[PDB]
Design a protein around this nucleic acid. Sequence first.
DNA 1: CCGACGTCGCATGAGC
DNA 2: GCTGATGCGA
DNA 3: GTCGG
Length: 327
Amino acid sequence: PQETLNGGITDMLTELANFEKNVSQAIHKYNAYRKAASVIAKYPHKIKSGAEAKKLPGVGTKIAEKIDEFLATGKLRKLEKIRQDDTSSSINFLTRVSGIGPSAARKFVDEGIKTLEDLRKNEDKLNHHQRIGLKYFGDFEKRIPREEMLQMQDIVLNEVKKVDSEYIATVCGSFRRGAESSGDMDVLLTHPSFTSESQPKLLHQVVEQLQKVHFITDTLSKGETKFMGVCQLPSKNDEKEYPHRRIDIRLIPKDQYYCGVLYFTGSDIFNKNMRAHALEKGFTINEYTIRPLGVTGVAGEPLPVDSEKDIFDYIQWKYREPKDRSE
DNA sequence: CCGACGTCGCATGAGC
DNA sequence: GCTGATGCGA
DNA sequence: GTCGG
Ligand code: NA
Ligand code: NA
């Protein structure tokens, strides 16, 4: 299915989605619109009527109406209006700064701050995270080609191992599924000395090392189990310098590691299928553990998990490679 | 008709 | 000062 | 906004 099929529609729905999230502060309306956009984006026919579209799950009466209007007129009146609305288009825009959510963007536009220029004139109203998001606004909205991701992995695995050879680290996300590009780097981390029934420096030392070799350049947030920050590949001599990229590193108990890896590998749709499965086989799977129900439905103790495959075994699925976890 | 729609670590605000 | 709600991002 | 108990 090509973009040129129903692209106008999915763009429209995605625009609408973003105003719900950032302007109207209606996060469920936001996800409803994205859900419709997504199911439509998969549908392999150019849509002819909102009635055709309504058949899809996630598309109801009100989106069917909008599709009709768009189909007949080539636009949506409501969207046209909000696009031209100075206040709301500015609120929607500021949220593209990482750390500026709908509430902070609301406040800014309230006092006159509407543009990146205005943000740059008012640094002392920005918190740490927001300032970082400003500084790297453009880099962050760029994608990371897999070749850079490989090079970033090399550095991450090398430096983690050098800190302590018993650490285990996995770059997950769409990268681990084989994607030709990524939006950030998600690293999952563990160590034999850290279990559920079990230093608070296991994460610190790794981050410190990645800072020391100047891979990690900034810190959005950091505590004993989750680090969120900025990184950058070393400049290849006289070449153009690489974009700064987003990198998360989280520490996970060794006995919850692979549930974490399975889950943060995705995809989202695969995760729902697999956890749907799953239930119907007598087990409940979350990001942490797999547990058995329960004739009355009462979940028992977490089951020992020592590989991704272990989880597949428990619910008699054949282990599926990350490459084939598209859904 | 009407509630669910994921959940949670961390930074920062607010209330005491 | 401590506690615990909220905003944010994933 | 959409779904579903
Ligand atoms: Na429907
Ligand atoms: Na943002």
